[PDB]
Amino acid sequence: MQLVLAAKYIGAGISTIGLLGAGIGIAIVFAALINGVSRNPSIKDTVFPMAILGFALSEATGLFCLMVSFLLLF
Amino acid sequence: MQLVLAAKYIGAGISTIGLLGAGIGIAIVFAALINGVSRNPSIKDTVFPMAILGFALSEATGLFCLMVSFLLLF
Amino acid sequence: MQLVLAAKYIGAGISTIGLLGAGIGIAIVFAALINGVSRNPSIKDTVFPMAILGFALSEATGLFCLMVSFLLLF
Amino acid sequence: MQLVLAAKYIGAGISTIGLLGAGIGIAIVFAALINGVSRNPSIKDTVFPMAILGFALSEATGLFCLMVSFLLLF
Amino acid sequence: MQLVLAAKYIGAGISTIGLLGAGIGIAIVFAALINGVSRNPSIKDTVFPMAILGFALSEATGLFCLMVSFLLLFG
Amino acid sequence: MQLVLAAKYIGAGISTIGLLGAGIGIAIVFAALINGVSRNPSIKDTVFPMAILGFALSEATGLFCLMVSFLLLFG
Amino acid sequence: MQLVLAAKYIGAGISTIGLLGAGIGIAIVFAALINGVSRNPSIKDTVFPMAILGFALSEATGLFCLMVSFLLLF
Amino acid sequence: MQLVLAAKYIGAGISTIGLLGAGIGIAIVFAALINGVSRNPSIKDTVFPMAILGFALSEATGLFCLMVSFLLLF
Amino acid sequence: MQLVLAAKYIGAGISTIGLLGAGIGIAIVFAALINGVSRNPSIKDTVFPMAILGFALSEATGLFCLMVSFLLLF
Amino acid sequence: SSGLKLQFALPHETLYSGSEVTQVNLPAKSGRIGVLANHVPTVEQLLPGVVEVMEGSNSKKFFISGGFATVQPDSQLCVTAIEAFPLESFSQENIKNLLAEAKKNVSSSDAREAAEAAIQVEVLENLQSVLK
Amino acid sequence: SAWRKAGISYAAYLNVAAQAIRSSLKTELQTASVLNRSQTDAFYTQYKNGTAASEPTPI
Amino acid sequence: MLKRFPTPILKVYWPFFVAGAAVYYGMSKAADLSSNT
Amino acid sequence: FYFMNQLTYGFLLMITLLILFSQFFLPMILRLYVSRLFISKL
Amino acid sequence: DESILLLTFLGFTGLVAKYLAPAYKDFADARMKKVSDVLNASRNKHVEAVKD
Amino acid sequence: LTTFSLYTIIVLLVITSLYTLTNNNNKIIGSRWLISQEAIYDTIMNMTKGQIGGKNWGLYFPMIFTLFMFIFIANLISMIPYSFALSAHLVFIISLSIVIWLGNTILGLYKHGWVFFSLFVPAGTPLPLVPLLVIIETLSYFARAISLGLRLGSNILAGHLLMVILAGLTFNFMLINLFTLVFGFVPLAMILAIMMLEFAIGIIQGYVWAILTASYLKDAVYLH
């Protein structure tokens, strides 16, 4: 009983590093985006949303994990 | 019963990071897409149907662990 | 006593995240599908079966994992 | 004795993610397969036995882990 | 209540390396940046604002890590 | 000593996953093997010995880990 | 209360290994730096300031991590 | 409070594996130097100050890691 | 009071895998050394000292890991 | 379009000029590349090897002494090289080995002769694959 | 192997390849046209700024 | 104001309204079965 | 508690916005398109 | 507490009125002038087509 | 009465406030307030033309608009601090997603009947794994359903709550001793960047919703 709130707090601790997959993931997209525009400057509009689109796919999945922290925080 | 719900809560806490590589996963798919269409321009409406396919299946990796996070909550 | 069913919960928690591998895995099976077929668009009809070959039975191992979690849950 | 069964439950839990070595591993082989047929469409039938050979005696390694898991459950 | 803040402190300890994808992430963006100006010399004025786009809301994710590690430490 | 058998069981559990170091690494050799023979068709009988050479002395290391597991399960 | 400072100390222990990612990241930065200057001798110290810029406020994350470790000692 | 100095010992233990990133990355910058001078033999050690620079204040992270292990250890 | 030497020994357990990617890193340097010398055979006497220089005081940092694994074992 | 326009060119006689074709296989610096109907615009320097041309008909096999493969962005592949080759007639081991040992002997001479000698050693050892 | 570094330029590299394929010709079909392709008689004289001369060397 | 055009909303978009009614009735079952919490 | 409340008023606004946007707000702009193109083509 | 968030919003709207609104002004002005230009030019062109 | 139903009233009033007062007396020239919905119309038009690619593609062009705009407006309202959560009710949003997915299933099953289950065999495979690709497509068939809503509102449940708690952090930053007033600006700029990201988690998440259901409509109307 004196442990379950402490256990939910360490559960918020372990449920944190899953945004690491965010921290890598969106990275390579912009990396690819630079290699998207380095070898072909006149196609960048073609990829300027289409890169950042996948951004919101990856970011939100990173933004999955910590809100599962937060309802485990409360 | 003071300990079993604390245990299911931290067990949901460690069943959080299964989206981790999926946070990589969908992103690196789009990485190839930026190396795809910026390489070859007229493939934008050819590989994008399968990529948004391969997006969702790459969610099918790192989503069920998240719902392993959910129903272990209940 | 209560702990032997409580430990099932955290064992199910970390015994799911092997799909992490699938979370990285099938992604590049699409990505080198993209980086492959971006280079040669007329090989898609030749390789779209083989890709969905190398997708499926490289995903199913991860589909083992939560199932191994599942009866470790139940 | 009343503790060692919970220890074997979480021992099956911690001995689960070796199919991670499956989940990445064989997948990346198919990665090099698809490029290996896209930039060279005539050498499908030469690599594909050899490549699927490189399937088996990799993926079974991951298989080892989960049967170890079951002997830590049985 | 003698144990809860101690467990919060170790929870802030394990909520600290989630900014691992900070230390790689933005960095490898700059990697392609150094590539992108190398194989294309006249693209720098093009790429670095977009790249600093791919800086900022790529590192703020890592900020999320330590603000968890700031709150579970304190609040 | 009521716990040491449980200790050896869970130690066998955390000496199990070292075959991951097999499961990635040897795979990339076959990956490189594809980038052998798909790049050069006349190299096969050169490398298909050596690559499967490059199989064995790799994965045996991972074999080391699980045989440690066996002597951590019993010995 | 005799436990909580020990937990602070082991928390400072686990809050330390985040410099893994910064050490990999600045290495990848210098890796692409050498690989970009070897293919371009003429443009070296135009990029090298931007390289050391990205170096500096990429390593600032690991700087934040170990000063978080220092205050978690405190 | 026999727990606290032994806890400082194991805290020094978990503050060891941060240098993993150093032990990777201080070598691979010189691997990029290999790949750079093998292409371009003309400029070898005009970029070696950049290489040893990345070396020294990349392994400074692992220096910080084991000196955190020192200052928590004794 | 018998907790401190066993805690030092389990601290010697967690002070072990810091050479891990060091076991990667120096490895890929030789791999990149292959990727120098199989491409440019005229660079070997140039690269083989300095790269193996880039071997030694790379992996010695990995050696630092195990000597910390000694000095917490002692 | 479906298929591909092939334009094979030699300094004495261009063999194919605007022919519709299915598959070509040709040796580049990055390895042996097959090109099909559409393709990425790509310039590949051609190491001296073998080029196979498959059509609606069968695949004709040529030895080729090097050049450039160039994919015009309307998916028109041109090959610009030097030497043609029949099925197997134009090469014989009696002319190969007896000259090849002399070429390896020239490979120990002064530098300009020895470099061309080593080049011819590499070309004859590539012709060993045509010996097959 | 380092012919780009030590030996010939790339056009000359493929020219040595052309003489090698023409030297390993079939002696039945090594026609007079292919031997015409290997008949080098051009001479070069590097003039100087004062309209000086070298001897004509057989390239 | 705005010129009303008779645009096809019933002979096109029936099944999403059908699914809305079905989810409303399933929510009736749910909030009659899971409101005693 | 208020799943019925939020759900029912949201669905009512869904039907409202579908019929509303369809009958008014899309073809009021399509008239601008067709008018501009009919001036330009004449 | 929540006045800090509205204070951040006031600073953000100050940045917007500094930075974004003149850019969207230039954007809308460029599109407006382009539409008016083509629309007037088609009319003058078929005026000259009547004159032909 | 409900404040959330009042929020729906605010939604409908702003939707009236995007076209009606926007239109300066039905002018050809298309004024600056109209260029907004002009660009929105074209960026949804050029999206779903090339997405579904139907000969009859515009027929579902209305719904993809009105499924966009509701999510586009309801994630520009709670951005104002003194508000209550609009889109963060996961029950309502996931209920909407269930309605959308079930309508897709009913539409495809009325169009195709039995052969609508021809989606479960996408590509050529050898025999012993033909049903397996079926199974984790069926397992992905409702995973298609559940995640799409469970993304966005859980973003918004992670969105505004974020700007709640860190505000309290800056409330617990500035009631300790007066030295907290010096260099206490960087949390304010950090929450400023949080709102910068919060506009992204509104707008681009709405466009994510639109593009994924565009692909779902293409799969539901046409079989591969």
Curated annotation (Swiss-Prot), chains E, F:
Top-level taxon: Eukaryota
Effect of L53F: In strain: DS400/A3, DS401 and oligomycin-resistant mutant
A biological process from GO: proton motive force-driven ATP synthesis
GO molecular function, one term: lipid binding
Keywords linked to the UniProt accession: CF(0), Formylation, Hydrogen ion transport, Ion transport, Lipid-binding, Membrane, Mitochondrion, Transmembrane, Transmembrane helix, Transport
Record localization: Mitochondrion membrane
A GO cellular component annotation in the UniProt record: mitochondrion
Effect noted on mutating C65S: In oligomycin-resistant mutant
Family annotation (SUPFAM superfamilies): F1F0 ATP synthase subunit C
Modified positions (N-formylmethionine) in chain numbering: M1
InterPro entries: ATP_synth_F0_csu (IPR000454), ATP_synth_F0_csu_DDCD_BS (IPR020537), ATP_synth_F0_csu_sf (IPR038662), ATPase_proteolipid_c-like_dom (IPR002379), F/V-ATP_Csub_sf (IPR035921)
Membrane topology: Multi-pass membrane protein
Pfam families for the chain: ATP-synt_C
Membrane-spanning ranges: 14-34, 52-72
Biological role stated in the UniProt entry: Mitochondrial membrane ATP synthase (F(1)F(0) ATP synthase or Complex V) produces ATP from ADP in the presence of a proton gradient across the membrane which is generated by electron transport complexes of the respiratory chain. F-type ATPases consist of two structural domains, F(1) - containing the extramembraneous catalytic core and F(0) - containing the membrane proton channel, linked together by a central stalk and a peripheral stalk. During catalysis, ATP synthesis in the catalytic domain of F(1) is coupled via a rotary mechanism of the central stalk subunits to proton translocation.
Family of the protein in this entry: Belongs to the ATPase C chain family.
Protein name: ATP synthase subunit 9, mitochondrial
Curated annotation (Swiss-Prot), chain J:
Keyword tags: ATP synthesis, CF(1), Hydrogen ion transport, Ion transport, Membrane, Mitochondrion, Mitochondrion inner membrane, Transit peptide, Transport
Leader sequence segment: none
A GO BP entry: proton motive force-driven ATP synthesis
GO molecular function: proton-transporting ATP synthase activity, rotational mechanism
Predominant cellular place of this UniProt entry's protein: mitochondrion
Subcellular location: Mitochondrion; Mitochondrion inner membrane
The keyword Cell division is annotated on this UniProt entry: no
Any one Gene Ontology cellular component term annotated for this protein: proton-transporting ATP synthase complex
UniProt key word Phosphoprotein: no
Bridged cysteine pairs (disulfide): none
Family: Belongs to the ATPase epsilon chain family.
Subunit composition and interactions: F-type ATPases have 2 components, CF(1) - the catalytic core - and CF(0) - the membrane proton channel. CF(1) has five subunits: alpha(3), beta(3), gamma(1), delta(1), epsilon(1). CF(0) has three main subunits: a, b and c.
Function: Mitochondrial membrane ATP synthase (F(1)F(0) ATP synthase or Complex V) produces ATP from ADP in the presence of a proton gradient across the membrane which is generated by electron transport complexes of the respiratory chain. F-type ATPases consist of two structural domains, F(1) - containing the extramembraneous catalytic core, and F(0) - containing the membrane proton channel, linked together by a central stalk and a peripheral stalk. During catalysis, ATP turnover in the catalytic domain of F(1) is coupled via a rotary mechanism of the central stalk subunits to proton translocation.
Originating gene: ATP16
Residues of the full protein shown: 29 to 160 of 160
UniProtKB/Swiss-Prot annotation, chain K:
The keyword Transmembrane belongs to this UniProt entry's keyword annotation: no
Any one GO cellular component localisation term in the record: proton-transporting ATP synthase complex
Family annotation (InterPro entries): ATP_synth_F1_esu_mt (IPR006721), ATP_synth_F1_esu_sf_mt (IPR036742)
One Pfam assignment: ATP-synt_Eps
Chief place where the protein resides: mitochondrion
Alphabetical list of Gene3D superfamilies matching this protein: ATP synthase, F1 complex, epsilon subunit superfamily, mitochondrial
Alphabetical keyword list: ATP synthesis, CF(1), Hydrogen ion transport, Ion transport, Membrane, Mitochondrion, Mitochondrion inner membrane, Phosphoprotein, Transport
Phosphothreonine modifications at: T51
Statement: the UniProt record of this protein carries the keyword Mitochondrion: yes
GO biological process, one term: proton motive force-driven ATP synthesis
Molecular function as annotated in GO: proton-transporting ATP synthase activity, rotational mechanism
Subcellular localization: Mitochondrion; Mitochondrion inner membrane
Superkingdom per UniProt: Eukaryota
Quaternary structure note: F-type ATPases have 2 components, CF(1) - the catalytic core - and CF(0) - the membrane proton channel. CF(1) has five subunits: alpha(3), beta(3), gamma(1), delta(1), epsilon(1). CF(0) has three main subunits: a, b and c.
Remaining remarks: Present with 4280 molecules/cell in log phase SD medium.
Family: Belongs to the eukaryotic ATPase epsilon family.
Protein name: ATP synthase subunit epsilon, mitochondrial
Species this chain originates from: Saccharomyces cerevisiae (strain ATCC 204508 / S288c)
From Swiss-Prot, chain O:
Gene: ATP6
Effect on the protein upon substituting G206S: In strain: D273-10B/A1
Transmembrane spans: 1-21, 57-77, 90-110, 115-135, 156-176, 181-201
Protein name per Swiss-Prot or TrEMBL: ATP synthase subunit a
Source organism per UniProt: Saccharomyces cerevisiae (strain ATCC 204508 / S288c)
Pfam annotation, one family: ATP-synt_A
UniProt similarity note: Belongs to the ATPase A chain family.
Localization: Mitochondrion inner membrane
Function: Mitochondrial membrane ATP synthase (F(1)F(0) ATP synthase or Complex V) produces ATP from ADP in the presence of a proton gradient across the membrane which is generated by electron transport complexes of the respiratory chain. F-type ATPases consist of two structural domains, F(1) - containing the extramembraneous catalytic core and F(0) - containing the membrane proton channel, linked together by a central stalk and a peripheral stalk. During catalysis, ATP synthesis in the catalytic domain of F(1) is coupled via a rotary mechanism of the central stalk subunits to proton translocation.
Subunit structure: F-type ATPases have 2 components, CF(1) - the catalytic core - and CF(0) - the membrane proton channel. In yeast, the dimeric form of ATP synthase consists of 17 polypeptides: alpha, beta, gamma, delta, epsilon, 4 (B), 5 (OSCP), 6 (A), 8, 9 (C), d, E (Tim11), f, g, h, i/j and k.
GO molecular function, one term: proton transmembrane transporter activity
Gene Ontology BP annotations: proton motive force-driven ATP synthesis
UniProt key word Transmembrane helix: yes
Superkingdom in the source lineage: Eukaryota
Keyword presence, Heme: no
Topology class, membrane: Multi-pass membrane protein
PANTHER family: ATP SYNTHASE SUBUNIT A
